[model samples]
Target: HGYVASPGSRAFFGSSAGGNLNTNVGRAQWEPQSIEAPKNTFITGKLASAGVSGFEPLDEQTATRWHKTNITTGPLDITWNLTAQHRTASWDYYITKNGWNPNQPLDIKNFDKIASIDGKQEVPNKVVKQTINIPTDRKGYHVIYAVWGIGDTVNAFYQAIDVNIQ
Candidate 1:
């Protein structure tokens, strides 16, 4: 339903080239939300806490960025539409702490790695879906950080979701 960032580039955030939304990925640097980029959108990436693709390491807060708001139940069904299908490694999900501030940018310390769906190469219509159990201890407002790691390349997709757990 959206566009992916150009391969091997990080100019999407706030750049007119990135559609004014930091939704694109392939960022080659570690930047915090405070570093002044576009606001919530659909960007994606890695833990690069150790550096990859010549990019320096990043803190948890700057790992995966951009998001949107939605409501769902315990078993959340996540789906994606792919313009081009890349061999995938896995679909990972992280959840913020129980009482974390949703207004602030997401920090790695704020989440617990709750799930990792196996990756695949054969994608139907270049799309995919998976479901995960929301943490029982978490309630109210929270952010779900989703990472899509590509298998054939040194890149991944990052996305955040603001959820009001009911």
Candidate 2:
């Protein structure tokens, strides 16, 4: 089997924010990667980097409004729920660098469809499952992430697990 992130880490974000958005405040633990470069345009669009490490809490007065605590480190399981008036069209995930940014490919940037359940009551709170393989192309550490947007509030949770590929 493989490892997951955000589950054990108890990582989560408020309904207002989808995932970690702010950048340039946290310290970079690894070499910086461009958020505009990826092997697959459809899967890795918009995002300069896919996965990253060393994530810091956003620096802002209302930053606490969106609790990003319990940051997942790997080996995890993610589950979330949303308002009743939500009709989830699709979900796109990413693992960008520490300070990676994007604009056009934001909507199209593809990370991975952890899970996509159809038909639902209430806002949009549903259990989501996803798996990510460590980058075998290179040797190093990276971060885990996901982005889900539907109609209303977005509440999500995830876990991460350490990886050792040999």
Candidate 3:
């Protein structure tokens, strides 16, 4: 189980980070490493089941209305805090389209892949860091959806970070 540590993901930073944050990610504020779903399955922001997956209300369109991390369009480092480690398959990142509507709910069509790391069934450090480029074409408020896939197990963890590009 894991969560984004730097440029904090919603589940990682939550209310304590302050400033316009989502209040419905129940238990995530307490149990961050608990968010997991089947590998190869793209998370829809809703828990597959209460207490079974996670408590982040990520499917909502208002996520950009929540806390946002300001970043420039260029190289960015994303760090993950792994509480319980497992054989890793890969780490994937998806971001909202350049002209995406902040008011529209997040969907598959709204995102494009920005970066990926091949883990090759190896376990990662307690703290894993990867650098990604946000691309020069994107501006304004956006969401970076990150997924950590476990190699041996059938599960993967999902985390989304809100960002404002300059």
Candidate 4:
């Protein structure tokens, strides 16, 4: 059971109000570990195989706007809070393209890899943390996607962070 604690991810926001209706996570807050899917599934591999869906376009909205975490272009620390730290492979970070369309439904085309922490077989204390630089060229609202690939399991956790890069 792991989830981004700093600069809360989409599922983190969905755990509260002003969250995206399209980001269906019935037990998201209580069971965030469910976000994991088969490795390499990446952006498309959220929780579909876990019997969850309608979250593909995390940009998809309801009556209210999803809360945006105010941030700036610079080096930032990303942290994942885990109830159980299963052995890991790598922690990957991704961000929206400079000209990504916030109006369109999100896809792999909108994002780019910014950081990949490899071979972290065991985290010192089960808290996964990494420092990734938010691209200086990107501005406005964007989704900073984080991937937690479990080394032992055929699963990887997906966290879509909603940020307004300034």
Candidate 5:
């Protein structure tokens, strides 16, 4: 659940980078927190506020690369692939303030909690879905931060999805 070292990659660099190093094992199903902080740290880590740690720097561009799309209307159906089947506490959603700079690091202070769904003890390895009603008047490119808090552990997985509201 913690930082899983990248196998064989440890020969290059001590961190998750390749070339005989301790490569950071990046997860495809979810990003394991510490997006804009010092390398390999979580939300509570000291480096998080300093914006130094990240396996791959999660800036505006990277966030876009991770997830992006256009929504034509409200009541969007969002889904997740629970490959790990971890026990989850809840699924929380937050929206960045309008006119916020996408290029800058994510600041929790700038977010507004929009919706939350209580999760079961064990989030099965299947397709989990939820519907969210977007503000029809809120137009322009915005970032929606999703947090999956684990019920059994102190860990949580995060993902940032960008959308252009029409």
Candidate 6:
């Protein structure tokens, strides 16, 4: 019922916006975890990384530079843990632009790609939950956490639990 960080850093981020303490964490590999791409899913192993990329101190301010990033267990180790959980981890994300202030939006693009996560239209404030299926041949897969809000410039948080194969 706890989480850890990659590179073994002494700082913690994203939890303030991610709500209460995250439970069911995983183990770390190297400085940061690795995530691979196969088809439908990935295996997010240990606590990769997290931090604030950008910020804006204004009303209705566009914020596309605030974001985070993370790495799963991929391109290296692969195991079959049907009862895996997220006991500890870190969220590396960025908030390019927020819907809060359209007048002064962040200077970031790629709505359909990285560097951006649209809110209200694509995903609202509601904590999104997604499940993936990985092949038995591959090692593991990865996961992504990103989102924005309407009429505000803030990078929100999302969570998933009981991530298993069975």
Q: Alpha carbon lDDT of residue 138, candidate 4?
A: 86
Per-residue lDDT tens digits of candidate 4, residues 1-166? 5778778776666665324322454556445545766766643333222324544434353323556788999998887888777888888887889887665555666688899888568653566677899989988888787878888888787777778778
- 94 in model 6: Cα distance from truth in Å? 13
lDDT of 1 by residue, 61-137 (tens): 33234322345546877665455566666677788887776455446777888898877654435546667888778
Model 4 alpha-carbon miss at residue 158, Å: 0.5
User: Model 3, 84-127: lDDT tens per residue?
Assistant: 98889999998988888777656656789999899988988999
| lDDT of model 2, residue 117 | 41
* Model 2 C-alpha lDDT per residue in residues 104-159, reported as the tens digit of each score: 23222323333344334334433445444333332222333434434333432122
Please list the C-alpha lDDT of all candidates, in the order they appear.
0.49, 0.30, 0.75, 0.68, 0.49, 0.22
Range of the 10 consecutive residues with the lowest summed lDDT in candidate 6 = 52-61
What's the TM for model 4? 0.81
Q: Give the number of colliding residue pairs in candidate 5.
A: 20
**Ranked by TM-score, top first:** 3, 4, 5, 1, 2, 6
Number of the top-ranking candidate, with lDDT as the measure = 3
Instruction: Kindly report which residue stretches of model 2 are placed more than 4 angstroms away from their true locations once superposed.
Output: 1-5, 8-56, 59-78, 81-85, 97-125, 151-166
What shift in Å separates residue 153 of candidate 1 from its native position after superposition?
0.8
Off by over 4 Å in 3: 15-22, 43-56
